[PDB]
């Protein structure tokens, strides 16, 4: 019963528990794309003021 | 000996992983009732079959 408890626990932990190391990898990737997109959105708003001359 | 031989049958009867009997002879080679394949690739026919025999008294 204890032996079967361990192997059953392993299988559920594999599917349900996140890979914390790999999750920080994706957390940083999307976080940078937010700053990259935010800067370009601020760039695009300034773009229209050119033709006022 | 009477109890222990009974215990041998009990494990095989109730050997379940995700509600499937493992040691009752279903996934054997000679007279199977189901086939266990793991799809271990990213394409069509990339799967390998596992045999588990009967392990009761």
């Amino acid at each position: 019963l204890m032996n079967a408890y361990e192997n059953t626990q392993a299988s559920e932990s594999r599917i349900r528990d996140t890979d914390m190391a790999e999750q920080m990898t994706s957390f940083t990737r999307y976080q940078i794309l937010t700053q990259a997109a935010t800067s370009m959105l601020a760039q695009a708003n300034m773009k229209s003021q050119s033709v006022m001359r | 000996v009477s109890q222990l031989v009974d215990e041998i049958d009990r494990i095989a009867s109730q050997a379940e992983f995700n509600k499937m009997k493992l040691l009752t002879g279903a996934f054997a080679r000679l007279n199977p009732t189901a086939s266990m394949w793991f799809h271990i690739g990213a394409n069509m026919h990339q799967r390998e079959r596992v045999y588990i025999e009967t392990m009761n008294t």
């Binding site: 349900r16 528990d17 708003n45 | 995700n18």
Partner: protein
């Protein structure tokens, strides 16, 4: 040049909004410590995960 509508800004907002949705998802995984928090991330896997928790307990 057209000043009535800013097509690039609409494109910029569209991709920025999507990334915040993926940024929100990752914080849920990191804070709870579980790969699946809301249904639909892996519906097939969530059923197997909850069945094993019943078997685990």
């Amino acid at each position: 040049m057209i000043i009535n509508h800013n097509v690039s800004a609409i494109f910029a907002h569209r991709t920025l909004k999507s990334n915040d949705a993926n940024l929100s998802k990752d914080i849920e995984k990191l804070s709870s410590g579980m790969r699946i928090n809301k249904a639909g991330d892996d519906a097939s896997g969530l059923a197997v995960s909850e069945k094993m928790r019943t078997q685990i307990a």
